[PDB]
Structure formats: C-alpha cells, structure tokens
Design an enzyme around this catalytic site. Structure first.
Site, short mmCIF file in Angstrom:
data_model
loop_
_atom_site.label_atom_id
_atom_site.label_comp_id
_atom_site.label_asym_id
_atom_site.label_seq_id
_atom_site.Cartn_x
_atom_site.Cartn_y
_atom_site.Cartn_z
N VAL B 143 0.99 -1.18 0.14
CA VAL B 143 -0.34 0.07 0.33
C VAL B 143 0.81 1.63 0.28
O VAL B 143 0.30 2.64 -0.50
CB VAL B 143 -0.92 0.50 0.80
N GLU B 234 8.14 -12.41 1.87
CA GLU B 234 9.24 -12.23 0.74
C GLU B 234 9.88 -13.64 0.49
O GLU B 234 9.65 -14.39 -1.11
CB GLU B 234 9.94 -11.00 0.92
O1 LIG Z 1 2.05 -1.85 10.17
C1 LIG Z 1 2.24 -1.96 8.54
C2 LIG Z 1 3.13 -2.63 8.31
C3 LIG Z 1 2.79 -2.97 7.16
N1 LIG Z 1 1.37 -3.07 6.75
C4 LIG Z 1 1.46 -4.15 5.53
O2 LIG Z 1 2.20 -4.49 4.44
C5 LIG Z 1 2.78 -3.92 3.55
C6 LIG Z 1 4.39 -4.32 3.54
O3 LIG Z 1 5.39 -3.65 4.20
P1 LIG Z 1 6.58 -2.55 3.76
O4 LIG Z 1 5.47 -2.02 2.95
O5 LIG Z 1 6.58 -1.33 5.87
O6 LIG Z 1 7.10 -2.85 4.05
P2 LIG Z 1 8.74 -3.52 2.88
O7 LIG Z 1 10.04 -3.31 3.15
O8 LIG Z 1 7.95 -2.21 1.61
C7 LIG Z 1 8.50 -4.69 2.37
C8 LIG Z 1 9.43 -6.18 2.52
O9 LIG Z 1 9.54 -5.81 3.83
C9 LIG Z 1 8.75 -5.85 4.57
C10 LIG Z 1 8.77 -5.90 6.20
O10 LIG Z 1 8.68 -4.83 6.42
C11 LIG Z 1 8.10 -7.53 4.64
O11 LIG Z 1 8.80 -8.62 4.82
C12 LIG Z 1 7.19 -7.85 3.09
O12 LIG Z 1 7.87 -8.95 2.65
C13 LIG Z 1 9.03 -7.32 1.94
O13 LIG Z 1 9.01 -7.81 1.04
C14 LIG Z 1 2.70 -2.79 3.79
O14 LIG Z 1 2.58 -1.68 2.21
C15 LIG Z 1 1.51 -2.28 4.27
O15 LIG Z 1 0.41 -3.43 3.12
C16 LIG Z 1 0.58 -2.73 7.28
O16 LIG Z 1 -0.62 -2.38 7.07
N2 LIG Z 1 0.84 -1.91 8.54
#
Ligand SMILES: O=c1ccn([C@@H]2O[C@H](COP(=O)(O)OP(=O)(O)C[C@H]3O[C@H](CO)[C@H](O)[C@H](O)[C@H]3O)[C@@H](O)[C@H]2O)c(=O)[nH]1
Ligand SMILES: O=c1ccn([C@@H]2O[C@H](COP(=O)(O)OP(=O)(O)C[C@H]3O[C@H](CO)[C@H](O)[C@H](O)[C@H]3O)[C@@H](O)[C@H]2O)c(=O)[nH]1
Ligand SMILES: CCCCCCCCO[C@@H]1O[C@H](CO)[C@H](O)C[C@H]1O[C@@H]1O[C@@H](C)[C@@H](O)[C@@H](O)[C@@H]1O
Ligand SMILES: CCCCCCCCO[C@@H]1O[C@H](CO)[C@H](O)C[C@H]1O[C@@H]1O[C@@H](C)[C@@H](O)[C@@H](O)[C@@H]1O
Ligand SMILES: [Mn+2]
Ligand SMILES: [Mn+2]
Lengths: 277, 277
Positions: B143, B234
């Site tokens: 998101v 992931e």
């Molecule tokens: O409080 C929250 C936390 C998360 N989310 C939901 O989870 C999604 C991924 O988390 P984020 O983008 O912070 O991590 P990124 O660093 O961009 C995404 C990467 O790191 C993640 C952990 O920080 C996971 O490990 C994921 O698998 C990896 O792709 C975020 O877009 C929200 O849709 C939410 O709704 N409320």
C-alpha cells in the site's frame, strides 16, 4: 495441480543479458518465439515430466507420400519428445505400406485408414473423442520431412504456429495470404503478424480441435462459394492464427529447407527439415 | 471459448528486429519478462476485454498505513487496468479511516476488516470462496506505493512475480534469500533465478490461492520450529516461485523506488513506485 520442482543447479539468468539479440524472442501479444538459446531444456523437461505429459503427433501419408514414413518416424524416434510419452497417429490410404519402425519405451503408433479439407476434417471431425482421451497435446506435421535435431517440450503450449522459412524476413504485403475478399481466408495487405507454415502447428487437444474445426468450416464455406484458397489449409490456418493469437511461435529452426535456403547464421540449429519430393 | 479478434491495423512485428536488445525479455522456462516495448497493449486489451476479465486487487492497510490509501487508490484509478472490471479489496483494522475515493465505471471497492502471516493467510484462508466467485485474476500489492504510469492486462497470466528493484542486476549469491537450512524458505547459494519483491505478485485466483496457501503453511512450520525467515512472507514467496516457475515476470518498471535508485536508462517507464514511509 503442479508439484514442486526439485533442486536444480543451472546458470543464473541475467536480466541485463539477453539470450538472443539478433532476433525477436517474444511476440507483441507476449507469446515466446522459440529459438535456440531462449530455453533451458532441463527446466522444461522437469516441468512437463512432472505432469506425465503425453504428446500426440499426427501425420498424413497418402498415395506416394507413404515413401516418406520410414525416415520421418526413425528420425522422430531420435529427436522428437525423447523421454516423454508419445503417440503417433499415421493417417494413410495404404495401411500395409506403413514401415515397421522400432519405438523407444513409452511410445506408440496407431495406423488410421482414410479415404483438400481432409487433414483439418480428419483431425477435428473423426478423431476428436480419441485425442481427448489419449493425449494432452497434439502436434500436426507434414510427412515429407526429417528430424535432424531436438524438437521437444519447449514447443508445448495451448496453441502454436511455426514461422514459414521463406517469409520470416518478409514484409506482410509479400506474405502469400489469400487476398480475395470472397474467401473466408481473406487477409488484407495491412493485416498480418507472421506467415505460418501449414506443415507444423499444434497445441492442447482442445485448442487444436478448435482450430481444425474452424478451418474445416471455413473451407466448406469457400467450397460452397466456388473458391479454393491460394494455399489451401495453410491459408485458413493463417487466417485463424491472425484472429486467435498463438501462445507460442516456433522459429524457422522448426521447419526449414536447407536445399532451398542454406544455413543462415540466425539458425543455430536445423531441427525439422524438408526431404526432396 | 475465445471469440475472434476484430480486424486491427498495427505495425508488423519483425522477426529480425528485437523489441529490446538491452534486457532479457523471456525467462529460460519461456515466461515473458514484461518491459515497455515488448507488448502491444491494443492487442492485449482486445484479448482480455473479449473475455470480460475482472481483476481483483488486494491491499493491506493496517495501523498507520491507512494514511497511504488515498494516493494509492486515486492513482490506481488513473493507471491500473483502466477499461477493465476491477474489484479492490482493502484489508484494514480501521474501516472508518478508508478514504472515500471516486471510482470509474465497472470498478468497485470492498472494505474487509481484519485483526507476519496475516497477508498470506488472509488472502488464502479467509477470502478463498469470495475471490473465486468475484474475479478472474488477483493482484496482491503493498500500500505504501503510488501508480505513475500504465499497469494493465500485460501482467495477467496464471502466476507472476515482480523483480525486486534492488536486485535485478545482482548475482544470485547476493540475493537476500533465507539462507538457514532450518527454515522452509531456505535457498542455497547456487540456486535461484531472480529475487522477487513481496509487494507485487498475482495470477489466476486458483494459482494465487495455491501460492498463498503454500506460503502460509510454510510460515506455520517455521513458527512451530522457532524460526522467522529473514524477509518474512517475501522469503517464502521466493522459495515458492523458485519451485513453481511464474508464467510471467514483471520488470522493475512495476516496482520501483526513485528516491533510492533514480531513473536508469533501462527503465523507460516508472509504473508503480514507493512513497516515503
Ligand atoms: O504496520 C503495517 C506494516 C505493514 N503493512 C502492510 O504490509 C506491507 C509491507 O510492509 P512495508 O511496505 O512496510 O515493508 P517493505 O519494506 O516495503 C516490504 C518488505 O519488508 C516487509 C517487512 O518490513 C516484508 O518482509 C515484506 O515481505 C517485504 O517485501 C505494507 O505495504 C502494508 O500494506 C501495514 O499495512 N501496516
Ligand atoms: O499426395 C499427397 C499430398 C499431400 N500429402 C500430405 O500433405 C502434406 C502437405 O503436402 P506437401 O508437403 O506436398 O505440400 P507442401 O508444399 O510441402 C505444403 C504447402 O502446400 C500444400 C499444397 O501443395 C498445402 O497448401 C499446404 O497447406 C501448404 O503448407 C504432405 O506432407 C503429406 O503429409 C500426402 O500425404 N499425399
Ligand atoms: C522451389 C520452390 C520454392 C518455394 C518457396 C516458397 O515455399 C512455398 O511457400 C508456399 C507459400 O507461399 C507454400 O507454403 C509452399 C512452400 O513450398 C514448400 O516449402 C518450401 C520451403 C519447400 O520445401 C517446397 O519444396 C515446398 O513445396
Ligand atoms: C534505505 C533502504 C535500502 C533498501 C534496499 C533493499 O530493499 C529492501 O530489500 C529487502 C530485501 O533484501 C526487502 O525486500 C525490503 C526492501 O526495502 C523496501 O524496498 C526498497 C526498494 C525501499 O523502498 C525501502 O524503503 C523498502 O523498505
Ligand atoms: Mn511438405
Ligand atoms: Mn512496501
């Protein structure tokens, strides 16, 4: 359902390194164009063996063309889908002229007596039920041919055609499509992706039955209207594949004539080739 | 059943002219890698509209991340599957914080209250029945993002992942796969095709339910064994897509961070991009 692949050790694909820079390897509708260097056959073989894939191969050998069967079949045994389940369907007016060819394990041959629209009609309206029960994919080829190199599961997909070796570098206006608007096979000069060869097409059984049914019906309309398309079933195949895009396209590696066209640098392998007729 | 495409006038694809010579556009298992210049969106739009395709888009907005919804949704309206049927599924702990976003015709939004394994579990074990009845494809995204350019039916396929923007030029040993053999997400240093981003994957409903079920089960095994994979869902997504090859791969056009990575020449478009968090 597809089970997991096992661990495999192979070279990493590198996003900033193309497999081939000299040729188009994907169509504008996102269908792979199959050339040597674009596929890892070990991965593909795993995928297709895990599904216990059975490939049917149809071939017509009518009148003098029965002479081509021995080489066709013997070389198919060396090169066509080796390691996979194969069912050959040999359509002929001379069942006794079919040579006795020794087959590898998991491979079988059926002789189907018959006696133009025959190939499209026979594939669709005659064998529909049988093919659906017996094979997963159908591959439909000319008999005046030999296999010289690997032809395998890299070709398999819901619907494929093969680039005609005389036209792969040609502009669409030069393609020998049917050009008379009175034919169901009609394609205007400003339409067309590729010129597909009538002698090598295939797909899933369902998609091949759809194609052959449609081509047969279109040929029947033309016959009722007193017109025969310039290249017969190939003209109709081209019209069908224009309006129903294939999900893979085979490069001219898969249908070549060395006597007529030599061995250009762009062809790393000559897989399935014309025999003098 | 797929009806015929209508007549269309577009440039002829030329076999001896690649669309892109600077990047890999097909994987070694014959899956297209989607870059600008590889697809004719007019052909693809025709194909998918003729099937009256409905695309579901899942997004989680939990705790402070509800702040990202307005821009996410407003830009999705400008760029995501425009002209096609879209169903947004917004999973949140704060239904009242979901902004009221004006939608184009044929588009709808459902707010699903919830309250890690949540995303994989919620997508699979919670919404399985609903998605199968309501949409043909599911697209599952982060998101904390905005759409800046076209994201359309070129992505749709039975199963896709997206190249993580930090690793598309990296050697596999550098990928941040889970490396402890005690985790179900374990991938050895000599395995791996790509590093896929957890924030953009999708496919048919059936294939997405398979993926999310498998990842959820693998995460539950890890939890029982007292281990959490290095990159959480992931890491498991990467293990799944190693063993179940995706049928398309999206280039980093589809998941980019301009603040961190700029705008390299190899990216002709920045389609879906990180927002500061
Ligand atoms: O409080 C929250 C936390 C998360 N989310 C939901 O989870 C999604 C991924 O988390 P984020 O983008 O912070 O991590 P990124 O660093 O961009 C995404 C990467 O790191 C993640 C952990 O920080 C996971 O490990 C994921 O698998 C990896 O792709 C975020 O877009 C929200 O849709 C939410 O709704 N409320
Ligand atoms: O007496 C026969 C005649 C044909 N056949 C069968 O039909 C196949 C195609 O014919 P051919 O290869 O001669 O034409 P090509 O020039 O290589 C193939 C092209 O021209 C054809 C007419 O000559 C059609 O128009 C076809 O659609 C087009 O592809 C041949 O391989 C045999 O399996 C047979 O068994 N007995
Ligand atoms: C000497 C003949 C030259 C023929 C070149 C063009 O090939 C022919 O193209 C037709 C469509 O315009 C149709 O597909 C028949 C095709 O001729 C066949 O395939 C060629 C590659 C040769 O093997 C030829 O002998 C065969 O008849
Ligand atoms: C400053 C942070 C640099 C992070 C670069 C690597 O990106 C991170 O890669 C991880 C896998 O090793 C995991 O996928 C998280 C990913 O970080 C996310 O995506 C990046 C492109 C940034 O948008 C970052 O802010 C975000 O947390
Ligand atoms: Mn022939
Ligand atoms: Mn994110």
């Amino acid at each position: 359902f597809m089970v997991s692949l096992p661990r495999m050790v192979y070279p990493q694909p590198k996003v900033l390194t193309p497999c081939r820079k000299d040729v188009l390897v994907v169509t504008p509708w996102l269908a792979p164009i199959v050339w040597e260097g674009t596929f890892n056959i070990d991965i593909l073989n795993e995928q297709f063996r895990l599904q216990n894939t059975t490939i049917g191969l149809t071939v017509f050998a009518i009148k003098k063309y029965v002479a081509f069967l021995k080489l066709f079949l013997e070389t198919a045994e060396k090169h066509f889908m080796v390691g996979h389940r194969v069912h050959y369907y040999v359509f002929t007016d001379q069942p006794a002229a079919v040579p006795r060819v020794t087959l590898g394990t998991g491979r079988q041959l059926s002789v189907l007596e018959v006696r133009s629209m025959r190939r499209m009609e026979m594939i669709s309206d005659f064998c529909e039920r049988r093919f659906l029960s017996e094979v997963d994919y159908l591959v439909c080829v000319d008999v005046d041919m030999e296999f010289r190199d690997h032809v395998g599961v890299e070709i398999l997909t819901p619907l494929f055609g093969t680039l005609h070796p005389s036209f792969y570098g040609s502009s669409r206006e030069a393609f020998t499509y049917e050009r008379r608007p009175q034919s169901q096979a009609y394609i205007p000069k400003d339409e067309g992706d590729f010129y597909y060869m009538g002698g090598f097409f295939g797909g899933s059984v369902q998609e091949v039955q759809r194609l052959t049914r449609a081509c047969h019906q279109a040929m029947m309309v033309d016959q009722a209207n007193g017109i025969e398309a310039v290249w017969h079933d190939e003209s109709h195949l081209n019209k069908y594949l224009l309006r129903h895009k294939p999900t893979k396209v085979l490069s001219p590696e898969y249908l070549w004539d060395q006597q007529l066209l030599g061995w250009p640098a762009v062809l790393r392998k000559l897989r399935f080739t014309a025999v003098p007729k």
